[PDB]
Structure 1
Amino acid sequence: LSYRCPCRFFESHIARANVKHLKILNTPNCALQIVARLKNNNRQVCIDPKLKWIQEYLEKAL
């Protein structure tokens, strides 16, 4: 139904250069909260929360 967590699967190889932004969803019920909107095709995909470059990218935004 409408009750499924929005991220079923995630991508593990997205390049920072290909991200327009990261969206961090306020979904405590769910295991996967990070979404990227991609530059090359304006697609939204869910991202591996262990993706190498994410921690520094978020830190730097603060």
Structure 2
Amino acid sequence: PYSSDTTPCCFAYIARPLPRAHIKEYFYTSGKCSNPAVVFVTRKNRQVCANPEKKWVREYINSLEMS
């Protein structure tokens, strides 16, 4: 069983690092999705898909978990 409401998934990854200071939150997309992914929420409240295997992505996450 699972939510019958839509769930966000990512089908593309932002090619380069987003400005760290423009990011306030992050979350991993559901494991139900075909692609693993990190979604960064910017201070303008935009949601950007990123590759969790990328070094900058992991560092941003580590940083965010400290703030």
What TM-score range do you get, normalising by the shorter chain?
Answer: 0.5 to 0.7
TM superposition score normalised by structure 1? 0.61
Unpaired runs of at least 5, structure 2: 1-7
RMSD, matched Cα: 2.8
| Aligned pair partner of 1:54 in 52, 57, 63 | 57
Q: State the alpha-carbon separation in 2 of the partners of residues 27 and 38 from structure 1.
A: 22
Q: State the alpha-carbon separation in 2 of the partners of residues 56 and 45 from structure 1.
A: 16
Give the partner amino acid of 2:58.
Answer: Q
Alignment partner, residue 32 of structure 1: 36
Give the partner amino acid of 1:45.
Answer: V
Q: Offset of 1:6 from its aligned partner?
A: 1.4
TM superposition score normalised by structure 2? 0.58
Asked if 1:15 is matched to 2:19, the reply is yes
Unpaired runs of at least 5, structure 1: none
Conserved? CA contact 1:32–1:46, under 8 Å = no
Residues paired across the two proteins, number: 58
